[PDB]
Design a protein around this ligand. Sequence first.
Ligand code: HEM
Ligand code: HEM
Ligand SMILES: C[C@H](O)[C@H](O)[C@H]1CNc2nc(N)[nH]c(=O)c2N1
Ligand SMILES: C[C@H](O)[C@H](O)[C@H]1CNc2nc(N)[nH]c(=O)c2N1
Ligand SMILES: NC(=[NH2+])NCCC[C@H](N)C(=O)O
Ligand SMILES: NC(=[NH2+])NCCC[C@H](N)C(=O)O
Ligand SMILES: [Zn+2]
Lengths: 414, 416
Amino acid sequence: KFPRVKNWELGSITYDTLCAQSQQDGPCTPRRCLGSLVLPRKLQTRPSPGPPPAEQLLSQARDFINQYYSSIKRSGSQAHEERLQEVEAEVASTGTYHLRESELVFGAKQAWRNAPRCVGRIQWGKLQVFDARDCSSAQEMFTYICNHIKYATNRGNLRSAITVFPQRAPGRGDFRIWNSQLVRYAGYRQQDGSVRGDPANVEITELCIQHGWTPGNGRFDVLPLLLQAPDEAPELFVLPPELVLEVPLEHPTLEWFAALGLRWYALPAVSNMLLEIGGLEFSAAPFSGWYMSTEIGTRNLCDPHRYNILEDVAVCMDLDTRTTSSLWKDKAAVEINLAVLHSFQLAKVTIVDHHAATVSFMKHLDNEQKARGGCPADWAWIVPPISGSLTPVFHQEMVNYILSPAFRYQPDPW
Amino acid sequence: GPKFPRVKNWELGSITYDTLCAQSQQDGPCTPRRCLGSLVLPRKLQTRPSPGPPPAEQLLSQARDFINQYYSSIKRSGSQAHEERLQEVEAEVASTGTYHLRESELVFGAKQAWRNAPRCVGRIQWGKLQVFDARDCSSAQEMFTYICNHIKYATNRGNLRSAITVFPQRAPGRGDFRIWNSQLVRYAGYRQQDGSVRGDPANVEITELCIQHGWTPGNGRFDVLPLLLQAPDEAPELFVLPPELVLEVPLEHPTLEWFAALGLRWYALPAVSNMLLEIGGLEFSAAPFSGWYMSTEIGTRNLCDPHRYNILEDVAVCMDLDTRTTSSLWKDKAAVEINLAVLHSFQLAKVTIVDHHAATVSFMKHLDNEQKARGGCPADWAWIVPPISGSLTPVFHQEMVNYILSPAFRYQPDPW
Ligand code: HEM
Ligand code: HEM
Ligand SMILES: C[C@H](O)[C@H](O)[C@H]1CNc2nc(N)[nH]c(=O)c2N1
Ligand SMILES: C[C@H](O)[C@H](O)[C@H]1CNc2nc(N)[nH]c(=O)c2N1
Ligand SMILES: NC(=[NH2+])NCCC[C@H](N)C(=O)O
Ligand SMILES: NC(=[NH2+])NCCC[C@H](N)C(=O)O
Ligand SMILES: [Zn+2]
């Protein structure tokens, strides 16, 4: 019932009792574990043909409110049952309800805290929550997005933020941001099977063209936003260059590195996930914080299905790309992550290396153990793409579950 | 689509379904409400000792199941020999309460247990395994001879060959055949004066135990330990492996001439000897197995782990790296060079070893093979992906389904 969690580096032991508070089931069963799966249709929140049965919405709602009041410590006062009957009443009549700006603020922070795949949750209590639930057009969403960016970037001193657009309603389409991230580089499928730019962004780069975008011819062209208001065709919105803070990549010692022309944006704002608070769902709620050096250095730049530069860098360093035993790949990677850490630091833009990050996650796990009696973590995601064992998280046993409020995955609006 | 776990490879975009998992028989650590897939020893991968023989129906159910697998492998399901063997087994379990495997049945189960090991990334050679029957063994001294024969064969002068030696199974009442060591070849861990540990911290408990049973300890950082073999109901006897048998590799770097000066070294033969081999309900408490090393097991885990040799900082200082700041990636720079040293050394010493890229690239082919063969392959992602350069390796991008298939290598409690 209560999983014994052990750290093999220190022999320390803890029992996760918070997992008992999970109400949403995962993909695993006693017969088999599916923990390494990126997304089963279970953790997904697909569209629907009818409204969520009241009985359920009411219970998830009641729970959230019970959580919120326990947080501000007024758990039990008249204001609690005043808010409980207010929801019970609104639900019984409209079939739904709405959240107060304070409850939404507590909800978004708790969704982050509950995000199993987030290694930066040490900073969960520090989130700027922009209420954009008064949006009605794609043009309004754009304005709301441009403010989110301008603020989050803050000239380089990045700061966590989230803009929450209008919730989903059983009687209409969804407010959606088509791009997976507010800032992404374009991926142009060339003549043969080749790809100019980011291979992960080919599909979206095609859709923008479909909606009249005039495409560039570079590996680092920033994509325009495709914002969609309920039941309306999406709209193309080119982002203001000055808003988009980018960082030219250079190496502290390898002078020729700079000559590669590599660069990466400063803001990691995820815009395709769904935020769920109290049973209500927000199909558009872009959030952002700052980058961990590996997200760019290893994955975005070194993944074989991404920029894939390992070899280019390797031959520049003059490594033996003949056999895998010379470790040219491992070597080239470290230098790339080094170039990233050097560059962002030189450009006075916030980043956190994987050692610093995982170290902070260890303290967070501790704080959470004392706070809630456990902490949901996804080992495969928490452990960095390189130097896994060189970091403390690798040696830490973790328990994974679904706690609400939560950031869920959701279908693409096309 | 198909009502089976859909598996995707994010690098290639290819999808496969796992039908094989349908054949599993034992529950795991996970439940729908929580994934305990990152635990090393959940009480679900362990098989506790038995103060009583397995209930004749359950033991028989596994037996029947194993026999069927055997016949399916030789392509004689439903045949006269198949049905006869089944009767032979339930007949034997009937009068004695247990049964015995046939020579070929054991070779099959043993290779099947390897094939079914979720945490092994070297399963591509599962078919090529030398099974040394040692079910005739009756004494601790005979165990030593067997193990020595094993090390000799498997070491084959740095041209390692996969092998396992199966000692007598667990009989009701009669004590078990146990090798107290975790591996045949293991360095000693001396609990120091200040509190530290000279040698290998992992082996402190066993090193303390060897001393209690009469071992005369040295005081080195790389002292091979003596075997503490135990025959049924008898006390464990100390046995010292002769230096000639224990092949070792002195570590040196291909460019950093000073690395050699570090005096670091590792043994060529990786021989796990504390795991229980389960086949058809029959338990083999002693059955050491070995193959060859994957470079990261030594260069990253054995040498760099904080709770192991922890030589990361030392090498960093020698490379003249700023170990004051995290952002310098000094841990990353040293570890790469240490792993390169391990690779280089074993190559120079003409001892068999495989790097994490090649090892991993070969596990992908094994996966494709096992897809076409059984409709899946139970893999433990956490253990399959190397402790370094994870995403530079293709298995990182491969979703994996993990489940328990019998025969299998399972953990068991320590003899003491
Ligand atoms: C404060 C700085 C932050 C850092 C350094 C950080 C870092 C990370 C990293 C390394 C990942 C994995 C990303 C990947 O490999 O795709 C991640 C995932 C995630 N983070 Fe954070 N995070 C931070 C802020 C935020 C904020 C502000 C939120 C939400 C309000 C958040 C929510 C999440 C969620 C839900 C995921 C899962 C993403 C997915 O499933 O694709 N993070 N974070
Ligand atoms: C042929 C060469 C082989 C290679 C390269 C290989 C490689 C590996 C690696 C890298 C591990 C991880 C061990 C750790 O990090 O603790 C592993 C685990 C394992 N291997 Fe293999 N293996 C090989 C041969 C064998 C053989 C011959 C057997 C058995 C007949 C076997 C059975 C297993 C099992 C059961 C584990 C589980 C380890 C544990 O749970 O502690 N392997 N192998
Ligand atoms: C298949 C596997 O789960 C997948 O490649 C995961 C592994 N761990 C990860 N971890 C993080 N942080 N991000 C990812 O994209 C991945 N991909
Ligand atoms: C806690 C976590 O399961 C543990 O540290 C695992 C991670 N992956 C591993 N992978 C391998 N190959 N070997 C190990 O010992 C581990 N340890
Ligand atoms: N720091 C974050 N919260 N990042 C969210 C995911 C960003 C994504 N991994 C990228 O490389 O763009
Ligand atoms: N290749 C193997 N059979 N490895 C088994 C585990 C060995 C262990 N990781 C070691 O380095 O000693
Ligand atoms: Zn699981």
